[PDB]
Design a protein around this nucleic acid. Sequence first.
DNA 1: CTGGCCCTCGCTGTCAAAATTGCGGCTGGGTGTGCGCCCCCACCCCCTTTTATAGCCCCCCTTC
Length: 48
Amino acid sequence: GFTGRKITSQIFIGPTYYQRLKHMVDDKIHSRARGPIQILNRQPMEGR
DNA sequence: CTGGCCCTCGCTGTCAAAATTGCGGCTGGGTGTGCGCCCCCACCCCCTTTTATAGCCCCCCTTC
């Protein structure tokens, strides 16, 4: 695509049934810098 | 005093059973949940009477 040159090795290409899974990154990304701290330990909370 | 033998008994090794602690690391969701009997002692309610009031309802009587 970038140069328009033929790729030397011929590629195996065709329709195939793909399916998207519920594990999306936006429901996983997580960060913290001095958030709330729990009662008993006065340590960081558990969970995103 | 010295030596040979079998005995109750003291102690030990050995086997066995009961008792004991731990069983990977992170993570993300959601969803739920929070005595007991029988007796004894204080305190209060209903038993009863009165009367007005009226809607409601049980009971007995009467009809056909």
